[PDB]
Design a protein around this ligand. Structure first.
Ligand SMILES: Nc1ncnc2c1ncn2[C@@H]1O[C@H](COP(=O)(O)OP(=O)(O)O)[C@@H](O)[C@H]1O
Lengths: 107, 136
């Protein structure tokens, strides 16, 4: 069990791009506060998040919210891998579209 | 009988009531209500009734069109329930007068209303008045 392998946990803050870790957890992987961290999930899915240091959390556990877990196709208490990648750069154009199942009645 | 002197003479007495061709009005008397439909008038479509104005009334009664009855229950046919009438109106104005809005906002409107009281207090009357006056 490599140190970059953790167990997901429910977060107190409901931000969709914030992941809370204990400082001791980040020290083992050279992770710093406010950096950009990649997380691999199941069924070939992965996500990108930012990190915040919370002392209430414990080393084996990593805190996320419901949307990130749904993107990663994982459930609470499952095991995920956390990596770091500095290639995440500022983008010029991002194309986003809404879902038909939720935008009914609003134009 | 002579419906003229029975109903129309007091109705147009001293009142310069505007009259449009094709409309209907209600006259209350003789322990009943009578609907009169205007057929024709000299000044094109609209006119003002005057003491010198001739009032023709000879002819068979007309047949009712798709227009609704004017003797049906309304908000003026219910009395003594002003607070409850206001509550019901504010509860049913949004789902009925503006229905499609609830497809947009996504908030669930009220569905079930229970009226209770002594028998003969007018629950069915209130229900019919609310249904009729909102076009439901
Ligand atoms: N508040 C009211 N104002 C006017 N008429 C009323 C009122 N309450 C009852 N009535 C009269 O009572 C009659 C029958 O009452 P109904 O509404 O059938 O009783 P219930 O409410 O027990 O069903 C109606 O024709 C109506 O004219």
């Amino acid at each position: 069990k490599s140190p970059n392998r953790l167990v997901v946990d429910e977060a107190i803050n409901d931000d969709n791009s914030v992941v809370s870790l204990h400082p001791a957890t980040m020290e083992k992987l050279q992770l710093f506060r406010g950096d950009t961290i990649l997380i691999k999930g199941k069924k070939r899915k992965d996500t990108v998040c930012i990190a915040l240091a919370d002392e209430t959390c414990e080393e084996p556990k990593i805190r996320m919210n419901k949307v990130v877990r749904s993107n990663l196709r994982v459930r609470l208490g499952d095991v995920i891998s956390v990596h770091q990648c500095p290639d995440v750069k500022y983008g010029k154009r991002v194309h986003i579209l809404p879902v038909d199942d939720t935008v009914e009645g609003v134009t | 009988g002579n419906l003229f002197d029975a109903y129309l003479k007091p109705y147009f007495l001293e009142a310069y009531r505007p009259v449009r061709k094709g409309d209907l009005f209600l006259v209350r008397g003789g322990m009943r209500s009578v609907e009169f439909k205007v057929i024709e008038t000299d000044p094109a479509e609209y006119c003002v009734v005057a003491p010198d104005t001739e009032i023709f009334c000879e002819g068979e009664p007309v047949k009712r069109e798709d227009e609704e009855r004017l003797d049906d229950v309304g908000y003026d046919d219910v009395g003594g329930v002003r607070k409850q009438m206001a509550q019901i109106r504010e509860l049913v104005e949004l789902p009925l007068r503006h229905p499609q809005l609830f497809k947009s906002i996504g908030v669930k409107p009220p569905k079930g209303i229970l009226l209770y009281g002594p028998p003969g207090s007018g629950k069915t009357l209130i229900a019919r008045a609310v249904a009729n006056e909102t076009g439901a």
